[PDB]
Amino acid sequence: SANSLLGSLRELQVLVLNPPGEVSDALVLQLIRIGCSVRQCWPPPEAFDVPVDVVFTSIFQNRHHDEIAALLAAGTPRTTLVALVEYESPAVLSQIIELECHGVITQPLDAHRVLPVLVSARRISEEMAKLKQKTEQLQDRIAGQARINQAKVLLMQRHGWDEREAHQHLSREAMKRREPILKIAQELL
Amino acid sequence: RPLIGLLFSETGVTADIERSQRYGALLAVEQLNREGGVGGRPIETLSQDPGGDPDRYRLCAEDFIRNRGVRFLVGCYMSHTRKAVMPVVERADALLCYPTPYEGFEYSPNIVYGGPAPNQNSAPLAAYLIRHYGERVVFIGSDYIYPRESNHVMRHLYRQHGGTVLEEIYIPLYPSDDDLQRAVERIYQARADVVFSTVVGTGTAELYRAIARRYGDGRRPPIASLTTSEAEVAKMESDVAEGQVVVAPYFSSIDTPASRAFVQACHGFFPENATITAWAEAAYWQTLLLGRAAQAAGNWRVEDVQRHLYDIDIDAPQGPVRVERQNNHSRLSSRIAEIDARGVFQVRWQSPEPIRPDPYVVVHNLDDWSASMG
């Protein structure tokens, strides 16, 4: 996984969401040396058009901030976010916090700062997405377990069966009707 | 000596039904003595009062067999009193007639079972109850083996047929006042559709009266019992007793000449404090069978009398009965009755024919009873 993360950088689709100019140019050139697929866009659109894995943007005190914010709010949560920052003062930093960046690059940008930030930010966003996915799986699991257990008590008590017998019956019907054990359980309940 | 030992309590928790059994047995002796006794010699009886105590039953059985030469006994009611006597009769090669309903699961070469096993009373009653009453039930029984075994089956039957057994309550055999009040409050708090009682003897009447008063004298759940007899219903106010449900092979209201003849015979012979019950009926027919088997054998030898027992199908007050040689149990009628407002037992269902006994059946198939009840 550090190994697979590093090995898949050349398949990432990176978008430099920033005005045309020297900064965008230097950033796009360093993302092409690293080997990512890189596009540059400006003014911020309303939806992406093509799948995007990582966005680099700057912090604007104007309507592109809200556009960018809305653009990524509606977007795929696994989209990694990196902000180019030139001020350390509270309104600018609050903007970074509200956008919920996964990484930052303070200006002036230079090639040495890019790869370490892209990798650490990508690990970060992927780890966030995984914890959220585990959270849903576990929520579903706790609920499932409960209905398998209440259905088992139901069979036990209905038929004068032990736990093992109730379990064998659920499994058997389940795997004879090509459906989840949970469906059988919920049918009973 | 043609001497029958009668082991029925006169005092104690089940004194009423057992006095009833004693007089039923005495009624038979009297009739047998008018039919020629046993080979010219009159049939004699010997009675002792064990007072519902299993150890006193054993001691009375032992006195009779050891010191009085008794080899033929009629007696016992509560199952542990039967268990206490059984070994004494088996070691003496004696014969005991048990004219009492019981939990089943017993075979004794020396016991002639004149009362129904669970396939003959509880099963039909379970089918009936699940058929006509709501499926939320509350159980209340006396704390000894029979109500407990009887609840063990009924609990399983209700759960198998989509019912809920809300509370399963037990009270001591001579239940204090507090015992009753606590029990009735639980019954009242469960809001059951039906009350299945297995309470036996003294305290039955008070129990049914307390359920009555407790409820807001309003469409209480009906009480269905496996144990309540005519002796308990006579101690109940008319309105308490009304609509209660009861099961037995015989009811004094049966509409036949044979039943009519038994009522009349009991009315002119039984004391004032001895009500006719289904167990007086069973003591009567069993005691009658003993006498006729002895008359057919020409002697009073257990071996000779016993042989002639399985071959004599009798015309009992309940209808026709016989004892099966394979298991010492009997083929018995089975009636389910609802008590009307004047304290009379109205038979609501009857098995089309006498039910053959199967004391060891574990799975009671309620479908057996679909045709005759619906």
UniProtKB/Swiss-Prot annotation, chain A:
One of its GO terms (biological process) is regulation of amide catabolic process. Keywords: Transcription, Transcription antitermination, Transcription regulation. One of its GO terms (molecular function) is RNA binding. It comes from the Bacteria. Disulfide bonds: none annotated. Signal peptide: none annotated. Residues 128-189 form the ANTAR domain. Forms a complex with AmiC. This is Aliphatic amidase regulator. It comes from Pseudomonas aeruginosa (strain ATCC 15692 / DSM 22644 / CIP 104116 / JCM 14847 / LMG 12228 / 1C / PRS 101 / PAO1). The lineage of its organism: Bacteria, Pseudomonadati, Pseudomonadota, Gammaproteobacteria, Pseudomonadales.
Curated annotation (Swiss-Prot), chain B:
Signal peptide: none annotated. One of its GO terms (molecular function) is kinase activity. Keywords: Kinase, Repressor, Transferase. Gene3D superfamilies: 3.40.50.2300. The keyword Transferase applies. GO terms for biological process: amino acid transport; regulation of amide catabolic process. The keyword Repressor applies. InterPro entries: AmiC_PBP1, Leu_Ile_Val-bd, Peripla_BP_I. CDD domains: PBP1_AmiC (cd06357). Negatively regulates the expression of the aliphatic amidase operon. AmiC functions by inhibiting the action of AmiR at the protein level. It exhibits protein kinase activity. Homodimer. Forms a complex with AmiR. Consists of two beta-alpha-beta domains with a central cleft in which the amide binds. This is Aliphatic amidase expression-regulating protein.
